[PDB]
Ligand binder design. Structure first.
Ligand SMILES: [Ca+2]
Ligand SMILES: [Zn+2]
Ligand SMILES: [Zn+2]
Ligand SMILES: [Zn+2]
Ligand SMILES: [Zn+2]
Ligand SMILES: [Zn+2]
Length: 263
């Protein structure tokens, strides 16, 4: 309940509520011009109801050649669970993971400093996270090295030629696609996960039968655990621990690794 955690938002969760296309908050959007400094603009999805307090935020990057449209479904699916979600475009579609990491941070700074009052008043600027697909997922990793105060990081089918992440301090949930041929899990997702410190709160979820582009369309397995990870780490909301620990066993999951329990 709220008495034991000022960041709890929404009713106590169930598998129904974390699998739902929409959570308990209605959502509005603020579009941000590509002319914004430091990144290519995007769309901010935010909860409309203010009666429970302010919210943490997650910036969400797409992958190589891709635009915010490839990530749009995350916007309201996650924001409706009580988050500000900023699906960005990058400066160019050809940007690499390091560049994408810088841009994720620029998008977060935009939320804190430059966003429309409707967004700004709903934001707890102390509770920020990153997520991204493919090179954008490599960017999520990069952003956490650049800014260790981030609360959470969710690299989705991540791509990065840098395979070493032993300096990461941010709780990181990597989602792999078993059949990925662009960012194969053998050489991207799994080594990244294994390189993160074993004392870091972390998880690896591999999706059975999934291709590289699985994160770009609604996927209930991705959504429910993205929501749970953000709740646990952005909101410190231990009502969501039940879904993360012990390891999920959903049929769609090829394998799951974790450092449960998350103290
Ligand atoms: Ca720009
Ligand atoms: Zn509570
Ligand atoms: Zn490295
Ligand atoms: Zn499989
Ligand atoms: Zn279940
Ligand atoms: Zn079911």
């Amino acid at each position: 309940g709220p008495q034991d955690n000022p960041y709890e938002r929404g009713p106590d969760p169930t598998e129904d509520s974390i699998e739902a296309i929409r959570g308990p908050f209605s959502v509005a959007t603020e579009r941000v011009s590509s002319f914004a400094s430091g990144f290519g603009g995007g769309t901010i999805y935010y909860p409309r109801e203010t009666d429970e307090g302010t919210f943490g935020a997650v910036a969400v990057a797409p992958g190589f050649t891709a635009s915010q449209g490839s990530m749009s479904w995350y916007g309201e699916r996650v924001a409706s669970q009580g988050f500000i979600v900023f699906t960005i475009d990058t400066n160019t579609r050809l940007d690499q993971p390091g560049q994408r990491g810088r841009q994720l941070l620029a998008a977060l700074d935009y939320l804190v400093e430059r966003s429309d009052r409707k967004v700004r008043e709903r934001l707890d600027p102390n509770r920020l996270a990153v997520m991204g697909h493919a090179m954008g997922g490599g960017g999520s990793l990069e952003a956490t090295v650049m800014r260790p105060s981030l609360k959470a990081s969710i690299p989705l089918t991540p791509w990065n030629l840098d395979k070493t992440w032993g300096q990461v301090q941010v709780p990181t949930f990597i989602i792999g696609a078993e059949l990925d041929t662009i960012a194969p899990v053998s050489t991207h997702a799994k080594p990244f996960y294994e390189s993160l410190p074993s004392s870091l709160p972390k998880a690896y979820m591999e999706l059975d039968g999934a291709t590289h582009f699985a994160p770009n369309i609604p996927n209930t397995t991705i959504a429910k655990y993205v929501i749970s990870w953000l709740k646990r780490f952005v909101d410190e909301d231990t009502r969501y621990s039940q879904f993360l620990c012990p390891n999920p066993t959903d049929r769609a999951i090829e394998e799951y690794r974790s450092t449960c329990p998350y103290k």
